[model samples]
Target: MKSYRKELWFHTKRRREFINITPLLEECVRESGIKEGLLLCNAMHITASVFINDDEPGLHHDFEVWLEKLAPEKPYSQYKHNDTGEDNADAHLKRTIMGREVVIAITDRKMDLGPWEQVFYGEFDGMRPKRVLVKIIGE
Candidate 1:
């Protein structure tokens, strides 16, 4: 078995934002020289997410608005996890909705993403720095 892994940390600009990171993942695959295998993008924090979707800017914005509306942030929301004395109940819900990991294919040393598809970093809790882990394992 041959594998290589790297962690990339991103500094977001808002309390909630979406960043397209498909290219970086491609680069990781190239760097690893793994022409075949699976690539895993994992978020290190619970409040963040790793998901797959289109890289369109407008669509990304729409997703943010819609998700926030679906699970709007409520610092005082009555969640047992919140009673533990943290204001991240919304984060938990949002993370669950978005997911924590994304898997992409490695084909001939390239990322096998669709025409409009791309890997995305979904940050439900912005205004802070979050880290994403890129782990690649191949034979």
Candidate 2:
């Protein structure tokens, strides 16, 4: 078996945002030249996530609302971790809820994803550089 690895970087303007990365993953698959294999994509930061979902504006908004409801970023006093001079405790919790990585089957040099299903990079704490790792392994 052989393996290919790559890292993609991002710097979002907003503190929290989700960017569609399916095309990027597809590009990695094509570059790997692995027709039949497994592709793994994962956020390299604890404050970020890699997940699968529909790329719809409404759904994205809903996720923002829901996550805020579950883990509010305000009241930095609510989290002891904030005492470390970091106010992104909520980002870590949000990442936990969102997920850390995704693995997809590759066939004919393409990711076998469902219709309307897309890969996304979930950045809970942005404005700085972050990266996602893509690893492919197969014949």
Candidate 3:
């Protein structure tokens, strides 16, 4: 079996956004040289997420609307967590709902995702640096 690990960093311009990362992770899988196994990608921050979804503009927009309805980010006072001088309790909740990692099967040294499926990086609280870890393991 072989293993490969790397971290990809990003700084979002907005406080909340989703960026497709299928291509980057595909490159990582190619570098791993693991034809049959699993590829794991995870967000390294509590306020961020890694998930699978179709890369569509309307879907992304819908996600923004949905997440906000689930956990509004405006009123920091609405959360007790923000009492410690923080203002991102909603971000944490968003991350939890969106998820923290994604694992996909590897076949022929390629990701075995569905035709419309893609990996995404979700930044619930942005403007600073964050990273996603990509680890591949298999024969």
Candidate 4:
């Protein structure tokens, strides 16, 4: 069996954003040269997430609206965690709701994802550098 690992860093211009990361993952798979294996991609920060979803602009907008309704970022006083002098409490909740990581099967040197299915990196607290970990193992 062979194993490969890499770290992807990001610094979004906005405080919150969802970035399609399928191409990046595919690049990693190619680098690994693993034809049949499993790939694990995960957020390295509590305020971020790695998830599988459709890459549609409308859906992405809906996600922003939905996440805000679920955990409003304003009035930072609403969360006890924010008392720590940080106003990213909502980001933590958002990450929890979205997810922390994604695992995909690899076949024929590519991800076995469904049509329209893509990987995304969700950043709730941005403008600063963060990282995602990608690990692949296979023959």
List the lowest-lDDT window of 10 residues for candidate 3: 26-35
Per-candidate Cα lDDT values, in order, are: 0.83, 0.96, 0.94, 0.96
Alpha carbon lDDT at 131, candidate 2: 98
lDDT of each residue in 4-54, candidate 1, tens digit only: 798888888877778888888878888898888888998999998999888
Model 1 ranges off by over 4 Å: none
Better TM-score candidate (2, 3): 2
- Flag clash pairs in model 3: none
* Model 3: per-residue Cα lDDT at residue 54: 85
Better of 1 and 3 by TM-score: 3
lDDT of 2 by residue, 35-99 (tens): 89999999999999999999999999999999999999999989999997899999999999999
In candidate 4, what are the lDDT values of residues 1-139, reduced to their tens digit? 9999999999999999999999999999999999999999999999999999988999999999999999899899999999979999999999999999999999999999899899999999999999999999997
Q: 1-139, model 3: which lDDT tens digit per residue?
A: 7899999999999899899999999889888888899888999999999999989899999999999999999799999999989999999999999999999999988999788889999999999999999998898
- In angstroms, the error of model 4 at 33 is 1.1
Models, CA RMSD each = 1.6, 0.6, 0.7, 0.7
Clashes of each: 2, 0, 0, 0
Q: Compared to the true structure, candidate 4 yields what TM-score?
A: 0.97
| Cα TM-score per model | 0.90, 0.98, 0.97, 0.97
Off by over 4 Å in 4: none
- In model 3, the Cα lDDT at residue 43 comes to 98
For model 4, the run of ten residues with the poorest summed lDDT: 109-118
